Amino acid sequence: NPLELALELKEKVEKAIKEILENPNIETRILRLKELLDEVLHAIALIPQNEETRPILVRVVVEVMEALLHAVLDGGEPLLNLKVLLEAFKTFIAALKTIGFSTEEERLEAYRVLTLFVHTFIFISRTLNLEEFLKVLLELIELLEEFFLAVPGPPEQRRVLFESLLQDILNTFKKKLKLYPVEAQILYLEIILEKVEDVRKHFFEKYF
Amino acid sequence: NPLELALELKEKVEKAIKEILENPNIETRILRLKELLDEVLHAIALIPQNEETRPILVRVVVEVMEALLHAVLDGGEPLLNLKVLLEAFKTFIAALKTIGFSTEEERLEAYRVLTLFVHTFIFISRTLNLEEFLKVLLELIELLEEFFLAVPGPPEQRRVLFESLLQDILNTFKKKLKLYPVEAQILYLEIILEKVEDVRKHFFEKYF
Amino acid sequence: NPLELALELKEKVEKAIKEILENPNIETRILRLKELLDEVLHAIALIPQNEETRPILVRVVVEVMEALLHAVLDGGEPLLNLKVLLEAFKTFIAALKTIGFSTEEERLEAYRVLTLFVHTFIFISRTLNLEEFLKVLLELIELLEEFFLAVPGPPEQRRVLFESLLQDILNTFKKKLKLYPVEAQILYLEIILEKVEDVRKHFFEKYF
Amino acid sequence: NPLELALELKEKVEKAIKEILENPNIETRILRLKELLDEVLHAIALIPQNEETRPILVRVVVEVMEALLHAVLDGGEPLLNLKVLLEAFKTFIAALKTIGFSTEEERLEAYRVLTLFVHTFIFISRTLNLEEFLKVLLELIELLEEFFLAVPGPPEQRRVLFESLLQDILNTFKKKLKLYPVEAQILYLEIILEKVEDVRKHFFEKYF
Ligand SMILES: [Zn+2]
Ligand SMILES: [Zn+2]
Ligand SMILES: [Zn+2]
Ligand SMILES: [Zn+2]
Ligand SMILES: [Zn+2]
Ligand SMILES: [Zn+2]
Ligand SMILES: [Zn+2]
Ligand SMILES: [Zn+2]
Ligand SMILES: [Zn+2]
């Protein structure tokens, strides 16, 4: 019966998270959390999927991702943390795709997780230099587009959240750029604005 | 149901403001209030929006902005406070645009908040020197134009309030300018008068 | 047929300007207008060139440049706006060179655009410090020389307009310099006077 | 009959483009587009060449290259996309040489595609470091020379477009160099100016 499998997977994930959080090494915590996320994805892949189990899997994946975000916020080199965050976010999108969403509560949970991820990524990536900043920001924008193409729902919130998150990214980029001479402003502002306009156009063509 | 979500968001914001206010550090209070404003915006973004929730969201945003203005008025460096005020007020326009306005009470509350913001900004920016003074006054005028383009309503009040606020800004600018030799008067008076004339022309073309 | 191509280019530019002006972000407006100028230059390059098309190309370029000047006058950091104005003016000179100039009406339109550019540049550059002021003023004088060498016509107007514009620049420079102690007067006044005398001598040798 | 072969090749290419654009992975999209371009070249190689088929082949090659440019603009490591762009542009030149050019419309289409390629390449290569920037710019200039030697036509447009593109490259190079200390300016400005002067001299000797 699928429901019992969902409960046993939930308990297994809870014990695994409790074990991993106990470890003193922060980098070890991050790596084991990423591996746990991948194993959770493979576990959902095997479990039968239906109405009742779907919210259970959604919640368990949300707990894993939130725990990983909190752990990656504690310590570590910023670049390694950002790369692990990107890989984990790709796995998160894949898990959300295979699970599928029906109820509104799961949609709101995923949207909250996305907002938390965006804020955490911006906060961590604040400390880098210019080139890595631009690279990670472009990767974040692309993954944002992929996630908004992954979760189906009403288009109004789909538009509002995308606009708000792109505005957050632009504000952070401008804030960072104001620390550099006038010449770099032109180049990097042009690059970021063109990328944002392109992704906005792609999304607006999609939802129509 | 949207209403219960509105109430619960209100309560969360109330204890959030209460907690943050007990913090001893001033700069921490300002920064966390700005974070709370942004998170509130993202919260309304997800909250289903209809007739009854609209006033509740307007009230909670008004309380957050008023608390931030009072906290900013207490202590801190002038320029940093002004920049945080500008960012938070831009977020305020974004939140008001997302919410939408129907009733007159919400409109009057928004106009009162705008008046409070303008007076506080002028009072704080009084202490700076002419270059930063002129800069902050210019983006203050631009953000005034954006806000008055954001909230729809009757045009007579939208004209009278704009004229009064521009008069306040001009009086403050003249008061500050009267401390320096005659040469600066010409240049800076010309700059400010041209800017205010241009924004007035833009608004008067808009509402017609 | 060249005439139909000129008309379709005109129409494309009009909707391009209409779309661009709609955007809320000021910096995006400025950058996209600069790209529109460059693409207009490239389009004119391919367009077959003859009598009737010349006025049409002169108009469309004039409208694009005027819209960019008005947009730049609205908002933005002074230095970035000035630099974008410089590159746009270089593109404008190149476009005027490739188009060719026969009729008097197009000449008067080009001279009016040059006067507008000079006044706007002076007004915007008023707010900078001495070093940036000197740099931007010297670049402005050099591009003025290039433009007056780009558009052929009767030499009396080419002399009178050059003298008037140089006088405007000198008056603005003196007005700005009167804010600072006596020592800076000697240095920067000497630099600007020598530059102006040199460019005047070059032009007067040229037209003879 | 050659005409039916041209239509069937057109339909095959449209179906292939539609299939490739569907793929989620961006790098796969780029690679399959490049392979499609090469296979298209081999297809025209076998296709009998005459008057009516020539415009059809020009159009289909233009669509393939435009789709590849748009896909390359979406995502990927900049250096990889630049190298793929260089290889695809070489293939594009070879295809244009094999097809031949008689009508003016095909010439204008090819020139527009060249302009799009130059702008996209400059925009993408903006983000690299100094040495890679210089290398890719030199390869771009060389391929520009080859393309302008590939498509025959009137020499006036051949001159104007070359001058405009070289000016674009020089402006971008100066803009990037303005981010670095004074010593690097000398060396790299010298290298780029000598290269562009040499290629201009070669072209001017050619067309005479
Ligand atoms: Zn795996
Ligand atoms: Zn922590
Ligand atoms: Zn936010
Ligand atoms: Zn107080
Ligand atoms: Zn007042
Ligand atoms: Zn160009
Ligand atoms: Zn204006
Ligand atoms: Zn092959
Ligand atoms: Zn795209």
CSV table of N, CA and C and ligand atoms in Angstrom, one decimal, chain C residues 35 38-39 41-42, chain D residues 115 118-119 164-165 168, ligand 6:
chain,number,residue,atom,x,y,z
C,35,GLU,N,20.9,51.3,-28.2
C,35,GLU,CA,20.9,50.2,-29.1
C,35,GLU,C,20.1,50.5,-30.3
C,38,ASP,N,22.1,52.6,-32.7
C,38,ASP,CA,23.1,51.8,-33.4
C,38,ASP,C,22.5,51.0,-34.5
C,39,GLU,N,21.3,50.3,-34.2
C,39,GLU,CA,20.7,49.5,-35.2
C,39,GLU,C,20.1,50.4,-36.3
C,41,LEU,N,21.6,53.1,-37.4
C,41,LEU,CA,22.8,53.4,-38.2
C,41,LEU,C,23.1,52.2,-39.1
C,42,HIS,N,23.0,51.0,-38.6
C,42,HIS,CA,23.3,49.8,-39.4
C,42,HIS,C,22.2,49.6,-40.5
D,115,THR,N,25.5,41.2,-39.3
D,115,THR,CA,25.4,42.2,-38.2
D,115,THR,C,24.9,41.6,-36.9
D,118,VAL,N,27.8,39.6,-35.4
D,118,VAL,CA,28.8,40.4,-34.8
D,118,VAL,C,28.3,41.0,-33.4
D,119,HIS,N,27.1,41.5,-33.4
D,119,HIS,CA,26.6,42.1,-32.1
D,119,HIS,C,26.5,41.0,-31.0
D,164,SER,N,31.8,50.1,-40.1
D,164,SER,CA,30.9,50.2,-39.0
D,164,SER,C,31.2,49.0,-38.0
D,165,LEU,N,31.4,47.8,-38.5
D,165,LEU,CA,31.7,46.7,-37.7
D,165,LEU,C,33.0,46.8,-37.0
D,168,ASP,N,32.5,49.2,-34.2
D,168,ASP,CA,31.9,48.5,-33.0
D,168,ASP,C,32.9,47.7,-32.2
E,6,ZN,ZN,26.4,48.1,-34.1
